[PDB]
Amino acid sequence: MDIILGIRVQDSVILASSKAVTRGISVLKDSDDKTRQLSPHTLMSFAGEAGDTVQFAEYIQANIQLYSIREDYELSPQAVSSFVRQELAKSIRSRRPYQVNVLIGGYDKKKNKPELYQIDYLGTKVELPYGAHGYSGFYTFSLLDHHYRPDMTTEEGLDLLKLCVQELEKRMPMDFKGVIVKIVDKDGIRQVDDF
Amino acid sequence: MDIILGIRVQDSVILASSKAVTRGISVLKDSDDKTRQLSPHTLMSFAGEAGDTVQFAEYIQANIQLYSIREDYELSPQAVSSFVRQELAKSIRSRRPYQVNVLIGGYDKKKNKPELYQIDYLGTKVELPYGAHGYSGFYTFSLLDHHYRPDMTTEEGLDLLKLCVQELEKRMPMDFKGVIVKIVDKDGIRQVDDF
Amino acid sequence: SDPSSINGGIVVAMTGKDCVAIACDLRLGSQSLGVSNKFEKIFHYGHVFLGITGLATDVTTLNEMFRYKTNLYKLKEERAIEPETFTQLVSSSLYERRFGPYFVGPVVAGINSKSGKPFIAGFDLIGCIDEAKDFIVSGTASDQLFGMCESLYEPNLEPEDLFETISQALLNAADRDALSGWGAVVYIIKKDEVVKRYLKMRQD
Amino acid sequence: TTTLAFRFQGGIIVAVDSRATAGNWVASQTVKKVIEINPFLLGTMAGGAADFQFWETWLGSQCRLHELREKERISVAAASKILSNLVYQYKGAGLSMGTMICGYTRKEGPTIYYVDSDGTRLKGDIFCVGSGQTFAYGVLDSNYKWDLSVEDALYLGKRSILAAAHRDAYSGGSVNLYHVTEDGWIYHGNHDVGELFWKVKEEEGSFNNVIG
Amino acid sequence: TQQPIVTGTSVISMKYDNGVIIAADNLGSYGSLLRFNGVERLIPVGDNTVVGISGDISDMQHIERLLKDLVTENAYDNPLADAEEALEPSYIFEYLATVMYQRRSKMNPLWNAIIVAGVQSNGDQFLRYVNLLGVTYSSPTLATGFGAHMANPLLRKVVDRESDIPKTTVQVAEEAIVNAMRVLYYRDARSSRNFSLAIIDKNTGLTFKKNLQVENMKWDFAKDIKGYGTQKI
Amino acid sequence: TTIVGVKFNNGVVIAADTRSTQGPIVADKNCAKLHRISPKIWCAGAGTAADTEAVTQLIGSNIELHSLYTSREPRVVSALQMLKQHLFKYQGHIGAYLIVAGVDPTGSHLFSIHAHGSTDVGYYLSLGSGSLAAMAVLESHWKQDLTKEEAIKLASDAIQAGIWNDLGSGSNVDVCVMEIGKDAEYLRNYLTPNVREEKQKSYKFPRGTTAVLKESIVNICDIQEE
Amino acid sequence: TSIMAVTFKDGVILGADSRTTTGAYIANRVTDKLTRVHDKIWCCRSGSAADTQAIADIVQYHLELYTSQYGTPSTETAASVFKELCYENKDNLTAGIIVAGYDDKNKGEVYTIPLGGSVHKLPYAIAGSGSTFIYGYCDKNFRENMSKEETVDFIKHSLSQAIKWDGSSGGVIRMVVLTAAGVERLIFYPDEYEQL
Amino acid sequence: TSIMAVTFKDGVILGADSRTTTGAYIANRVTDKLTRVHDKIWCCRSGSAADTQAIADIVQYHLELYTSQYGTPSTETAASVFKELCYENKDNLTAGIIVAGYDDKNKGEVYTIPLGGSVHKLPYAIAGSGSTFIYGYCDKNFRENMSKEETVDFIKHSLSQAIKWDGSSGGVIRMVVLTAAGVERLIFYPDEYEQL
Amino acid sequence: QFNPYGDNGGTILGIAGEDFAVLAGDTRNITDYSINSRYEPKVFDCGDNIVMSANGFAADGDALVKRFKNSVKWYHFDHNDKKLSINSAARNIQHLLYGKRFFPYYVHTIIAGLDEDGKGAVYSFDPVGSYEREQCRAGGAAASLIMPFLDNQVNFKNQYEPGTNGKVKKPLKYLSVEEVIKLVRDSFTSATERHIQVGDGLEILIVTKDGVRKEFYELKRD
Ligand SMILES: *[B]([O])([O])[C]([C][C]([C])[C])[N]C(=O)[C]([C]C1=[C][C]=[C][C]=[C]1)[N]C(=O)C1=[C]N=[C][C]=N1
Ligand SMILES: *[B]([O])([O])[C]([C][C]([C])[C])[N]C(=O)[C]([C]C1=[C][C]=[C][C]=[C]1)[N]C(=O)C1=[C]N=[C][C]=N1
Ligand SMILES: *[B]([O])([O])[C]([C][C]([C])[C])[N]C(=O)[C]([C]C1=[C][C]=[C][C]=[C]1)[N]C(=O)C1=[C]N=[C][C]=N1
Ligand SMILES: *[B]([O])([O])[C]([C][C]([C])[C])[N]C(=O)[C]([C]C1=[C][C]=[C][C]=[C]1)[N]C(=O)C1=[C]N=[C][C]=N1
Ligand SMILES: [Cl-]
Ligand SMILES: [Cl-]
Ligand SMILES: [Mg+2]
Ligand SMILES: [Mg+2]
Ligand SMILES: [Mg+2]
Ligand SMILES: [Mg+2]
């Protein structure tokens, strides 16, 4: 799929992901949620080749949920991101690799810190204050470089995120049919229904 | 992937043409008029390969304006369309052909009839009630097949045109930044500033 | 396309008098796009330091792999691995992937705890050992680093002088490379103390 | 490369970077990417080119010949079209250039024309061209207004190039500013990015991601 | 653009104290077939220059006619054609170098590597190389094809730099050339035993030696070599 | 790379330059191209550096185990057979071009091995990008019944020819002499005809020249007691 | 490469040049292309040196193991083992091999195995790049039941021409004589065979 | 194609096969490859039939016009005109031509012009695909100043072998004798030359 | 297929002083892994106190230099023996290079001399004619090895003044002709060590108001 964004603020992680699904000439759907909840305080958005994206996201989801049941314990965002990276790093030298780029936004309940991880299909992990995949970064990073602070509130983060989406809507050729925004904080994961 | 549309109603010809200009990754402009007035009662919209489009449109424009001055007489839409077709038919077997598709909407003051001509870069002329170039037709023709009448008013034509643009805006992947609509009738050529 | 220059980056190592220095830039990119200015390329296992340039996923993978192997080494041997031994381990590990190699340019640096002798070594992506006396270079600006090191370097430099030499070798090489820069780190290594310094450099 | 140019109250701002690369190798950090065509017209460069050194210097000769013949300053529209018609003859022949022909005349006012190696010729208010254009557009769009002071407009252009110089690997070196009125273009300093970045970071409170 | 068909291999040459020596074998190869065994590839121009040519033989023959025509043209309205205004090595070379570069620039090259060896009016040694690309260079030793790889190393042991030229006699230089020709016969799969050798001396003039043969070859040790490793019989 | 081997009266000598290259860049100026398969069987290697090292180590390891198994000093033909069969299996993809030499109970031996697994016997051999410059010298100066002193001279002269005339070769000359009834002597940097001249200037910087953001002590020691 | 094997009254003689080439460079000018798979069964090798050596090595192993179990193998048996390798691995091999041997029962025999892997029993055989130039000569000059001296002259003259015209062939002319008397090696140097 | 020209005491003889092939189909089994550019200057044609005919036609035109102005041309002159065409149009031609002629002053001469466009004056010349197989034979059996009958036998035996081994060559052996006496055509059928 | 281009290797270096200019270049000429010549002059005096070198493909390089020398000659004829200024020479070369835009001179051209104010001047070109005045420029095979060193030692990049810690830069003090030659020699000695196409000899041409002077230095021959 097309545009996925992430921004880590003071006390939460915010993930924006486009709603459009284009199969060639037509936009088949304009309300697609390009994300999966891996655990109560860990959310992974994704974008890449069709099929591979969901297949991968659900495979990861199942594995983390299996871990959660076995140990009766939620893995840290760092731990989940490392697991995910290894799966992609394993994948890239396979017969047919997973062609999937992901953002992992999680709130670490132990350290009481939000954490955003950006991992591409090669298995290239980086912890960031704000991240993106594909052409999304080319437009947004210049805005985020300017306006971003580590002590921003969630409402300030959403406003900065709106400014990013507006710039994408102005300068990107593809109509991505807006974004679904989700917030990950100490209280868990919720969706901003109006954006 | 520029969208240019045409519809011939009772007493006028209406040409809609997208405003977007995309140079790869960025939309450089969102207010581009993809049309030239060849004569007071003849308008040509165009879409094709960058540079070639305007170069061709202006070359045609100059030739028709030269004819108008020489004879102190406006050529019929049919005559202009035939001239244009020949230029493209000549072009296709050149060293470097004009890669330009056009719609020629004109009002014939002799016969008191609106006329719409669709000509592709190969020099393939067809007189139509409604026409389009590129992928535009794939979405719109099904709507036009259903709703079109030969006795429609200009206001009814604009409403049917809005329905076409809405469907394009819904199902096309590319954001073409809306359209500039122009009407060609007995009184000449005017632009619908609000659309 | 070329795996060794997608992410970009550089590593350089030098020997001094009773000391070694290893240094790297901090850039990680997706070709033209700069992605991270905190991607450190120098890791350490005990007193043995390893810098890795090249494809970032493999940089990470190999660090995790040599951490894995040096930890088991320590449990069984009941002692920390030495630079000479680690160099051989790196070479072995890389060559076993001969026809499906990690796209990396590793650089070992450290001081032998028993003999006190300063040691550096470089590798190609399939395990060939380049055990130089003077200096080792690696990454997208290796040509530039070769040019800097070959002119700036002199033997038997004191730790605080060596720091200036390696820092200037890296900085000026990185500035003549589009895919390197965005910060830099220099490790000055002595027999029983290690100082790590972040350099202030142009951020373009 | 990052080059921008935008119309505003005080005329036109033009801002460019200074970097030239051959692959990953940085060839030059000191490149003039603004051809001072004459005292009243400016032109930018981008695209693996420098074809535009020859052709925009040539354009200056054509513009000089025009005002000798017509006893009148050439229009921005006429100047830009001489260049666009020229490159159109050479269409298909080589690589990828992109330019902004900038000027201010009495009849037109402040005018910018995006001319392109594919033959494209677009009039417009704002343009960013080059490998770092998207980064520049981000800063420019969010902070652009018609009612900007000459001081603030100059800074916005400087800041937009800095934004791209930072992210885009093939942009950087230094920023060359120009301000264009009908009385002529005015040069506004060569600004090294190495020094400009730390200056802007500290003063503006931006680039919190980077450690300094 | 073409491909070479009938080809001539190495042309080797060096300077010595009073002049230059140049040599080339008498073979015209047709791929792996050693088709023509009587081909002269050293072509003298006047009594002070010898042009040695390798590569395509049809193009060589064309160049040969150009040089022949050059001498004719130089004699026209030139009372000093056999004296002050006679053709120099430098004149003959620059002409060829002009042609070779012009032809490469029309994407229709004369598929050759040429070495113009000679002695100037003032007694200076002339030795310069030119090829199908129009590339030119001069050196105390020059060689084409395989000669570049095998002859030069041997010839450079005699004249390693400019200062060694006055110290090298014609006997020592000729010996080095003749030895180099033997080495090329051992190791070049498209060479012949028969060759021609030319000496252009500022005192004794042009000496052109035809029908020379590689002699004093070492082959006896072949009898002792058996199998490719473990075989004893 | 220039590597040579030369037979003589009572043994065999091999030699090699010390330049390693990646394209037009010199990767190592003092590379070690002479590899020890066993105490009295040494080989010189050209082509891909990792391969010549790896393939020699492997065969050398198996040769050692074989020598312990058979209670006999290893033979050159064993190293030759084991190398060629390995290289052949990999169809030239292991880029190792070797000159294998040594002394054993059978006598003194000199062989060459190519990447595809072909072997050649000879009294004088040369491999690598400078083999043509080396072979020119060998063909000009080699004779039967060479002494030890003459063979070392001829071998190092052949390497020099490559060093000077071939851009793929350079720096120093390594030699290894393996005489019958004697320990093999490995002469590392036998010749050093390419020492760099003194630089015109010292580029030692004044301390505090480099701008620094942060400093910190790195904990290399283990977790501490108390 | 110019190789040939010729049967005569007393047995068979194998003949070969000594040139190994990497393109136009002569990698080895004193190569031994006549190689031994058994006491009195030898072969001439053409094409890839690596392939023909690997093959010849394996064949010698098979015939050594054959001998240990079933006694001395026939020349036909040796040719069959060569064939089995060349045929079954035709996609990955470039080997033109001439097998030649001497029994007391069958006397001198010659089998040629070209690229395909096919076997062809003949009175004499020629192969390698340089053989093309001597088809005419060999066909005209070959007789059956020649003497040893006549057969040596036939091979010497034939290979001399093959060498003269083929760039890939050259050096010394090696020969190996296979008769009841035993195994005799012969060598002929350029100065001798060139003037013929 | 197997073609050859051989000088002898009384003059020169041109020889050729008669096979024209489209791949493996014999388009013409009775082709005349010996063609006349002047009274006593002929040529043997190999390679493209279309190219060699177009060339030979043009050469005959040039020598006819030469004769009208400057009298009878030399065989060298004829070879030079052939060369000029083959050399200057080397990119678009596939023609291997042997020129052979008889003067009273120069007697029998033979010039061979291979693909490149180069000229080579020789005592005798062989060319065409089938010539490869008779380099060895022709080199061994050629003598200078042979008789007419000896030269006919030399060509017959040579081309016989070339035909025997080369698929592209076959049919009848045509010959053309050029001497002071005049121009004699000879033909030799399969039954005659195959049993040699 | 015929490839009309080739790489003859080598490396050149131009440094502009306060009242002088140097244009240095190694004398080694090569193809692939063979040395053609150990001394083949690459930097030429073109008259009017201008020195030039067109590094890369020697045939195109020799052609270009030849044509510029010719341009200088015809400049004197056509304009009353007027001295061709370095800025005018540079622009003239742009037109020579761009004149073959669609079949380029495969060379990296550098000229050096004095501007009309007497100050040192170095101009640098790409193969298709783009040019720019510079204080410092290395061109050719080993340009990537030399330029970073020159940024550091000529323009004092990344160097700051002790005690201030990154706050105050090192001042851009002018370099003497003796100081420049030291940097030139060390650049080529270093380039020779790590680049196989660089060596044999170093020829430097120094341009002052007094005229053009030459200096030659040995380089390693391996
Ligand atoms: B910019 O990055 O587009 C820049 C503009 C140019 C006028 C200096 N282009 C270049 O630097 C190009 C390479 C390139 C990089 C990225 C996108 C497109 C092109 N280089 C050159 O034009 C160049 C390189 N070396 C010498 C001279 N010119
Ligand atoms: B010699 O020039 O053949 C030399 C011998 C080697 C055993 C030290 N070869 C090399 O140095 C090879 C050349 C080569 C380049 C590229 C691909 C394969 C071979 N170099 C290396 O193996 C090499 C390259 N970079 C780093 C380390 N080693
Ligand atoms: B002969 O020329 O066929 C010869 C016989 C071989 C058994 C020694 N073969 C070669 O010389 C081959 C190449 C070749 C030449 C002509 C036809 C077919 C093949 N040479 C090699 O295999 C070779 C080349 N370089 C090093 C080692 N081996
Ligand atoms: B001979 O085989 O070269 C022969 C001589 C020709 C003058 C009659 N040539 C041909 O038969 C050619 C094909 C060819 C075969 C072998 C080598 C080169 C070329 N045949 C034709 O030109 C031909 C084929 N079909 C119809 C007409 N002509
Ligand atoms: Cl062999
Ligand atoms: Cl015919
Ligand atoms: Mg149509
Ligand atoms: Mg940047
Ligand atoms: Mg060398
Ligand atoms: Mg037949």
> Following DSSP, what letter does each residue of chain A receive, concatenated?
---EEEEE-SSEEEEEEE--EEETTEEEES----EEEEETTEEEEEEESTTHHHHHHHHHHHHHHHHHHHHTSPPPHHHHHHHHHHHHHHHTTSSS---EEEEEEEEETTTTEEEEEEE-TT--EEEESEEEETTHHHHHHHHHHHH--TT--HHHHHHHHHHHHHHHHHH-SB----EEEEEEETTEEEEE---
We report the CATH number of the domain holding residue G178 as 3.60.20.10
Q: How far is the CA of H21 from the centre of ligand 4 (A)?
A: 5
- In which residue are the tokens 């050399």 written? H87
- Residues D54, I102: C-beta atoms closer than 8 Å: no
Q: Establish whether residue G21 lines the binding site of ligand 3, counting it when its CB lies within 6 angstroms of any ligand atom.
A: yes
Which of I26, I30, I60, I219 to substitute to test the interface with E, most E CBs within 10 Å? I60
Torsion region of E193: left, alpha or beta (phi above 0 gives left; psi -120 to 50 gives alpha): alpha
Residue G97: is it exposed, middle or buried by C-beta count within 10 angstroms (0-12/13-18/19+)? buried
Distance from C-alpha of B52 to C-alpha of C100, rounded to nearest angstrom: 48
Residue A37: CB partners within 8 Å, gap ≥ 6?
Answer: A43, A61, A189
F106 burial (CB, 10 Å; 0-12 / 13-18 / 19+) is: exposed
Residue D169 annotated as binding site: no
G27 → chain E, closest CA residue: E187
Structural domains in chain I, CATH included, are 1-222 (3.60.20.10)
Residue in C146, C175, C201 nearest the CB of I145: C146
Q: Which two tokens stand for residue I102?
A: 């669609």
What the block records as the tokens of F25 is 């860049």
Q: Which residues of D are catalytic?
A: 1
Q: Which of I84, I90, I108, I87 is nearest to I13 (CA)?
A: I108
Cβ neighbours of residue I25 closer than 8 Å, sequence gap 6 or more: I10, I11, I12, I13, I42, I43, I53, I55, I140, I202, I203
Contact F132 E187 (CB under 8 A): yes
* Cβ neighbours of F197 in I, within 8 Å: 189
Q: Which residue's CA lies nearest to atom 25 of ligand 4?
A: H22
Going from N- to C-terminal start, the domains of chain F cover 1-226
Whole-number Å distance between alpha carbons of D122 and D111: 11
The Cα–Cα gap between I176 and I181 comes to 9
* Cα–Cα distance measured from residue F119 to residue F99, given in angstroms and rounded to the nearest whole number: 10
Residues of F in contact with I170 (CB under 8 A): 209
Q: H131 in ligand 4 pocket by Cβ < 6 Å?
A: no
DSSP for E138-172 reads: E-SEEE-THHHHHHHHHHHTT--SGGGSTT--HHH
- For E67-123, list the strands marked E by DSSP: 112-119
3-state DSSP percent of chain C in helix, strand and coil, to 5: 30, 35, 35
Please, what sign has the CA dihedral across residues D41, D47, D53, D59? negative
Question: By C-alpha distance, which of F27, F174, F48, I193 is closest to C130?
Answer: F27
Give me the residue label for tokens 């400057």: H70
Q: Residue F153: left if φ>0, alpha if ψ -120 to 50, beta else—which one? A: alpha
Would you say the CB of residue H31 lies under 6 angstroms from ligand 4?
Answer: yes
- Report the candidate in B58, B24, B13, B44 with the shortest Cα–Cα distance to residue B161: B13
Residues with Cβ within 8 Å of residue F156, at least 6 apart in sequence: F15, F173, F175, F190, F191
* Residue H194 CB coordination number (10 Å): 10
CA distance G90 to C65: 43
Of the residues G1, G31, G52, G179, only one is catalytic, namely G1
How, if at all, do strands F3-8 and F11-17 pair?
antiparallel
Instruction: State how far the Cα of B30 lies from the Cα of B22, in Å rounded to an integer.
Output: 9
Please give the radius of gyration of chain H, using alpha carbons only, rounded to the nearest integer. Answer: 16
Q: Is H1 a catalytic residue?
A: yes
Q: Please provide residue F41's backbone torsions phi and psi, each rounded to the nearest 5 degrees.
A: -130, 110
SS3 assignment, position D126: strand
Question: Closest ligand 1 atom, CA of D170?
Answer: 2
Contact F42, F110 (CB under 8 A): no
- Ligand 4 probe mutation, H14, H19, H21, most atoms within 8 A of CB: H21
CA distance C203 to D172: 9
Residue D75 Cβ inside 6 Å of ligand 1? The answer reads: no
- Nearest ligand for residue B121 CA: 7
Q: Which one-letter amino acid corresponds to residue H166?
A: D
Q: Are H15 and H32 in contact (CB under 8 A)?
A: no
H-run or E-run covering H61: helix H49-70
Gap between the Cα atoms of A62 and B173, Å rounded: 33
Q: Whose CA is nearest to atom 26 of ligand 4?
A: H22
Asked if residue G140 lies in contact with residue H161, where contact means CB atoms within 8 angstroms, the answer is yes
Q: How far apart are the first and last CA of chain C?
A: 23
Experimental method: X-ray
The preferred substitution site among D21, D44, D55 for testing ligand 1, maximizing ligand atoms within 8 Å of CB, is D21
- Residue closest via CA to ligand 4's atom 9 equals H47
Residues I25, I2: contact at Cβ < 8 Å? no
Hey, which CATH number is domain E1-233, 3.40.50.2000, 3.40.50.970, 3.60.20.10, 3.10.129.10? 3.60.20.10
Q: Whose CA is nearest to atom 2 of ligand 1?
A: D1
Task: Report all structural domains of chain D as residue ranges with CATH numbers, in order of start.
Answer: 1-212 (3.60.20.10)
Contact E29, E6 (CB under 8 A): yes
Q: By three-state DSSP, how is residue I108 classified?
A: strand
Chains B and H touch (3+ CB pairs under 8 A): no
Q: Is D209 on the interface with A (CB under 8 A)?
A: yes
Q: Which residues of E touch H113 (CB under 8 A)?
A: none
User: Mind listing the domains of chain C with CATH numbers?
Assistant: 1-204 (3.60.20.10)
Residue G107: its H or E element:
none
**Other CB atoms within 10 A of residue E31 CB:** 12
Residue pair G155/G2 in contact (Cβ under 8 Å)? The answer is: no
CB F53 within 8 A of CB F45: yes
> Can you give the three-state secondary structure of I174-212, one letter per residue?
CCCHHHHHHHHHHHHHHHHHHECCCCCEEEEEEEECCEE
- Partners of E135 on chain I (C-beta within 8 Å) are 6, 8, 31, 57-59
Residues F1-226: name the CATH superfamily: Aminohydrolase, N-terminal nucleophile (Ntn) domain (3.60.20.10)
Token pair, residue D26, equals 């940085």
The answer to whether G55 and G47 have CB atoms below 8 angstroms apart is: no
Please give the distance, rounded to the nearest whole angstrom, from the Cα atom of residue H102 to the centre of ligand 6. Answer: 23
Gap from CA of H3 to ligand 10 centroid (Å): 13
Ligand 1 contact, D45 CB (< 6 A): yes
Residue nearest to ligand 4 atom 5, measured at CA:
H46
Residue B111 CB burial class (10 angstroms; 0-12, 13-18, ≥19): exposed
Take residue E192 and report the two structure tokens written for it: 């012949």
Q: How many angstroms separate the CA of residue A19 from the nearest CA in chain B?
A: 12
Structural domains of chain A in order of their starting residue, each with its CATH number: 1-195 (3.60.20.10)
The 3-class SS string of chain B reads CCCEEEEECCCEEEEEEECCEEECCEEEECCCCCEEEEECCEEEEEEECCCHHHHHHHHHHHHHHHHHHHHCCCCCHHHHHHHHHHHHHHHCCCCCCCCEEEEEEEEECCCCEEEEEEECCCCCEEEECEEEECCHHHHHHHHHHHHCCCCCCHHHHHHHHHHHHHHHHHHCCECCCCEEEEEEECCEEEEECCC
Q: Is B50 left (phi over 0), alpha (psi -120 to 50) or beta?
A: beta
Segment holding H136, helix H or strand E: helix H135-141
- Touching E: F residues 55-94, CB under 8 Å: 77, 80-81, 84
Residue G132 domain boundaries: 1-196
**CB within 8 Å: E228 and F137:** no
Cα atoms in the 13 Å half-sphere on the side-chain side of G73:
25
Token duo for residue A152: 């921003």
Q: Which amino acid is at D148?
A: L
Residue spans of the domains in chain E: they are 1-233
Q: F220 CA to middle of ligand 8, Å?
A: 35
H21 lines ligand 4 (CB under 6 A): yes
